[PDB]
Design a protein around this ligand. Sequence first.
Ligand SMILES: Nc1ncnc2c1ncn2[C@@H]1O[C@H](COP(=O)(O)OP(=O)(O)O)[C@@H](O)[C@H]1O
Ligand SMILES: Nc1ncnc2c1ncn2[C@@H]1O[C@H](COP(=O)(O)OP(=O)(O)O)[C@@H](O)[C@H]1O
Ligand SMILES: Nc1ncnc2c1ncn2[C@@H]1O[C@H](COP(=O)(O)OP(=O)(O)O)[C@@H](O)[C@H]1O
Ligand SMILES: [Mg+2]
Ligand SMILES: [Mg+2]
Ligand SMILES: [Mg+2]
Lengths: 114, 370, 370, 370
Amino acid sequence: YAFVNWINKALENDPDCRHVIPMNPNTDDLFKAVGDGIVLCKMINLSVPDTIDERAINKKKLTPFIIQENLNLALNSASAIGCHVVNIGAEDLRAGKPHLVLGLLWQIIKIGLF
Amino acid sequence: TTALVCDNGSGLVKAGFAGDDAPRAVFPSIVGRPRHQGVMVGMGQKDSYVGDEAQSKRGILTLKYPIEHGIITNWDDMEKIWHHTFYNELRVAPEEHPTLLTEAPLNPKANREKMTQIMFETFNVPAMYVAIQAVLSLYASGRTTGIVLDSGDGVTHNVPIYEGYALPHAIMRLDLAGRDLTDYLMKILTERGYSFVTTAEREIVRDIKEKLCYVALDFENEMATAASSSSLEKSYELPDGQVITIGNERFRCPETLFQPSFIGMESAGIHETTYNSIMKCDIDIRKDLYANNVMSGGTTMYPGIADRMQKEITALAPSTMKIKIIAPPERKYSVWIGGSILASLSTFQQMWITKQEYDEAGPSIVHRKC
Amino acid sequence: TTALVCDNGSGLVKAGFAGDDAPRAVFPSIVGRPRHQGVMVGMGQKDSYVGDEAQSKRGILTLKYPIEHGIITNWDDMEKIWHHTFYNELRVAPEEHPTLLTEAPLNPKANREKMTQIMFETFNVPAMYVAIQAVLSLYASGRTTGIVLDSGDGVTHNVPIYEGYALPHAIMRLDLAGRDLTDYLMKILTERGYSFVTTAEREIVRDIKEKLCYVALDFENEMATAASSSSLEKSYELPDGQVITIGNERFRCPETLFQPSFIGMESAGIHETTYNSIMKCDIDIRKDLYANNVMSGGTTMYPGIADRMQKEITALAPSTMKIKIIAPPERKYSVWIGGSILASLSTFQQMWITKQEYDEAGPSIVHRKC
Amino acid sequence: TTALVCDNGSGLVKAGFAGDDAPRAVFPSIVGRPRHQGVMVGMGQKDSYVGDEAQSKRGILTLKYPIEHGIITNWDDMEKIWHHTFYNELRVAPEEHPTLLTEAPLNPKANREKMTQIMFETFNVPAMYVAIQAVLSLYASGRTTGIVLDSGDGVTHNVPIYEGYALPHAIMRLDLAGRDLTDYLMKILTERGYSFVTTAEREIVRDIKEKLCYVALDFENEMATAASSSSLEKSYELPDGQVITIGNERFRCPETLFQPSFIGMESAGIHETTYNSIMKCDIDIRKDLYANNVMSGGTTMYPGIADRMQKEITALAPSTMKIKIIAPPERKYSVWIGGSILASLSTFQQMWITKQEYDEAGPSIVHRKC
Ligand SMILES: Nc1ncnc2c1ncn2[C@@H]1O[C@H](COP(=O)(O)OP(=O)(O)O)[C@@H](O)[C@H]1O
Ligand SMILES: Nc1ncnc2c1ncn2[C@@H]1O[C@H](COP(=O)(O)OP(=O)(O)O)[C@@H](O)[C@H]1O
Ligand SMILES: Nc1ncnc2c1ncn2[C@@H]1O[C@H](COP(=O)(O)OP(=O)(O)O)[C@@H](O)[C@H]1O
Ligand SMILES: [Mg+2]
Ligand SMILES: [Mg+2]
Ligand SMILES: [Mg+2]
């Protein structure tokens, strides 16, 4: 649970990420939505909110069978900060893995802070 | 800052801190690519799989091994492999943490130069180092004198070390550790009404080799036992549901290490390689070499490799003095443990390849700093 | 504003809107045409009948199915049916609402291009898409992995899906879903003395099959029960004022699905078709395909077929792991429900067949976009 | 006496004598069985259809291949075919004429031992020899050095031979010769409103492939020619009376040999297979392997296969030394011709597997004498 608070204090650079990662209540909403790459598009709101909106890129027209459209749409916007783990693709991030998520969060922490 | 030690290998790549007794990176080193058609929107958005992400989906993907016996051909997939090894199993920043690299001996300068530039340009490294796997594996056994047989997945080299000093003229390299063994097994498995062509079954074949194949003591006696009796017949459960049973092709695969005629190469086996390396050393240091045979790598864990090697060396011995084979339980991580021990030392902090020196030295900085 | 989904099946037509869970325009795919002589002035005004008016007046009207096993053999009739659906059934403007059309796999290119051209030049719609009926049946029973046992009115195709990866080489289409069963029932009904030659009598036989015919467990035990006892005897009331009594032909009619040799076909049944389609798939994907069989379509809702092909798969399996088959209550309409569900996708909006792109591309844009 | 050269395979059967240049008994390895109901007495007595009696009545018979990609699964039908070709076709007694049988490389031991036990027990032949088809095809070309590309019905292997000596480690078996091409044509014929599901139409489709399909030089150029113009549209007359016309699915079917991704195969094409075989041989013998490319079998009968694979090899070569292509006219009988030539030699008489030594050794003598 302390990892949730650590990630919150590290990523408050973009408060909009707190709508994906837990917002200090130590829940587990991080894995599935971060595997979809929503935080990557949100992270730009650090300096200017005038960017990819959370409800503009995804308003859950991910139909009750195919929820496969948000993950690649949001992970393709990873030009910011840069997923230095180029081993991983959106195929495996569809579900998410501990080591893979930690490796991507490594870049998130590293470039999120100037 | 704590030092990092990364052990690269053709089959398994290891990483971790310096000082830790347990490894962290436990994953096959494979590359997979999508090859099927997605009729549903949102799929096909990946360039290359790396490791367990392809292991978990080994039905609809191919398998690619960018590491060919310690030779780095395609660096685009190696970038992905190193990114997998470092950030997924360290979570620390190499940009401010020293990382200890491993590299097979008798490696052309281009490979070492390119892996150095990649570290100093793709990454922003403050101080790196490149060490030989055989030398690092000697520190795992707690000794500084004796030969170390490092046999990974496609690399088999013998670097004799005497009181810390190594002999460059007694260093050779054999490209038969685990990959040609897997190829031999998947080729000979077709004699029992089986089909093994695609790489989707390569991981299953490797697992069957790891849990069934064993180094036999006498090959002719094993042939006689398999032909006459049917006692050494063990079955495997295929992931899809069928049941296979192999009794003769179990100990045939590990025998290719000692008998290279199975795969058709003029080089000698693993038992003669260390003897030839010792013969290339001094006559007054063979005493420390016969009694010090430290085993390492991913190959030498067959059930009966130590006794067979001891018998082979004794047959090669002049019947003067005892032969000792060291087979530590952590043979899979002897290189990584030795590297962690060496990097944990206070002396090892003063020859890392710093970036400021590299900026005015150039690409060949690893060549005389390692 | 909203997307339209018109499920064009061989026996039934389903239409509605985007985001709905139950189809609105449901009517059999029958075309009624006068064939007698009208002696009263004012009643012989309509030339052809599309909706249920032909069904209610089948005593002086004929029935003609334009789709024949996923192939539209009569396009003039389907133009009338589409016009009726867009005008009186949906009561919307096709020029302002995209329509989603259904098509079975392994379909001729000219047939596929006709649902493109007849819609773009006649109705002049903004954009459409042509989806796969197997994929649409894989839009109503939520799971990323699973082979679909789709069987509508005249098409029975099995497409294996693993995480979403479709295998075109593993698609096995069978032209035996509902029409062959109905014809089998008609021809076996003549043994007792029930002849069915008039095409207007087809709906009565279809209703009798729907309300009385069912898939049994064992055919030999059913033979024994029918020959010895008469417990499985049910009567049906004909609309014209007569009653029948069939007790042996109830379960014999659906037996053609598993044994198509009754009517004279060399192909295998539906229980073996899925098994063969799985066998030609990969080896590390069969674990997620054995316990996954999407059951849907207008054929597969007989009371006793789910356990039937479950037992058939278990017998055809090496008895390794479990077999479980989902039978969603909406079996018949799963195609339309899946069509609307697909129309409710996010990235599906920017990849409809654009009129501007279609005009500069041509009739072959359907094979390039879909 | 005169040895019998019987080349049994999944497709045609080549049976004859030793020393001749063309076999006498030529018939497909198809077993037909009655499937209709006999209503007239006097014609339902016959149920054994092996030779041409099954081809003529394919519409009332079930044609099945008991051999599956060089693997004999139905030995009961092989016994029937062997008895037929020994009694009615050759009209000789095998009890005094040795029968020369061929076997593909990388074959299971059970298949090799059963074909020996049946001949020694049922046919009680005095002696026979089991030879590799690739080795026998080299004698048909009159050479003793060079890789031979053999491709029959479902087996495609590459066995390079250097100065009589062959390289076992340079042998890989690909299960794509004729059957997967026929299946691919079967699947792609459905895009033109054609239905092909029965086994009786398999022979007609194979004939259509043999007389219309051809190996294209450039695939994208052929796609452009088929899409823009229709100058490659050839019509066919079906036996029942129908007329078909295919222009695009002509050169698409043979392209599966070079691009196995059409049928969903991870293995590479035949053009890269020979190059890969050459790479794993010696570097001093590649000169004799580039300049000696002798193909055998009926697969490479397409009008333009040799030029295409020569272009592929030239593209796959570093453009250092020349490539020579051998396409003898007697490729469909090169295996049989080579077998007859070898069996007619004076040095071939002293390694036949005689009855006494087989009885004293057992079924395993075939693996030691061959
Ligand atoms: N217990 C075992 N017994 C036999 N072979 C093994 C065993 N474990 C791994 N291998 C083989 O060794 C290879 C792995 O080598 P690797 O771990 O890369 O060596 P290194 O540790 O030097 O990098 C694989 O082919 C694997 O099949
Ligand atoms: N309850 C039922 N029991 C048996 N058969 C049925 C039942 N409902 C429909 N059918 C059969 O399904 C056929 C129509 O299928 P259809 O609805 O056109 O499939 P799809 O919706 O996939 O196009 C009819 O011929 C009818 O015989
Ligand atoms: N003129 C031709 N054009 C194209 N393909 C051909 C031609 N003649 C023969 N073939 C193919 O070559 C194959 C020959 O197979 P064959 O050698 O008889 O197999 P086996 O050795 O198992 O009996 C056939 O499957 C056929 O499809
Ligand atoms: Mg190693
Ligand atoms: Mg349908
Ligand atoms: Mg042949």
